[PDB]
Amino acid sequence: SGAIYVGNYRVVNRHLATHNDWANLVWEDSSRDLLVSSTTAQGCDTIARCDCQTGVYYCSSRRKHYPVSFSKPSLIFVEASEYYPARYQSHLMLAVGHSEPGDCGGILRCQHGVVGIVSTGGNGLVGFADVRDLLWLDEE
Numbered sequence: 001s002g003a004i005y006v007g008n009y010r011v012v013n014r015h016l017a018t019h020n021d022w023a024n025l026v027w028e029d030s031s032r033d034l035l036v037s038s039t040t041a042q043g044c045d046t047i048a049r050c051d052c053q054t055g056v057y058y059c060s061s062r063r064k065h066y067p068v069s070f071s072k073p074s075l076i077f078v079e080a081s082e083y084y085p086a087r088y089q090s091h092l093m094l095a096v097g098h099s100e101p102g103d104c105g106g107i108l109r110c111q112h113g114v115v116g117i118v119s120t121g122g123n124g125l126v127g128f129a130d131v132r133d134l135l136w137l138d139e140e
């Protein structure tokens with residue numbers, strides 16, 4: 001589990017979104033595994049605006065933050081998980097590291113701020129849904 005809080009937005013894995021999220025929907029994209037809902041309180045997070053490929057991510061199934069190198073966001077085939085069938089996921093970054101389903105929502109951060117959240121795992125990789133292209137998260 002986990003979310004990003006920026007402005008009056010809450011960014012969550014689409015597959016973990018709640019009824020309240022869907023009832024206060026700003027934007028969602030199944031192909032990206034992302035959903036954004038509206039918040040009353042202002043968020044603590046800053047979104048990275050950059051093309052970093054190194055950062056640190058939180059792994060709940062290890063209670064640890066790990067430094068990682070990761071690929072640039074792309075359209076990647078993802079094997080079946082507990083929460084999706086095998087499918088193509090867009091805007092996905094991969095790193096070598098540990099990720100189980102409940103690790104979804106852990107933040108990946110670089111020197112510029114939040115890069116994305118954990119969205120995929122298995123076979124010794126961790127996949128992250130990028131948010132750095134969502135420039136509208138920083139305004140309105």
Ligand SMILES: [Zn+2]
Nearest residue numbers: 050052110112
């Ligand atoms: Zn960066």
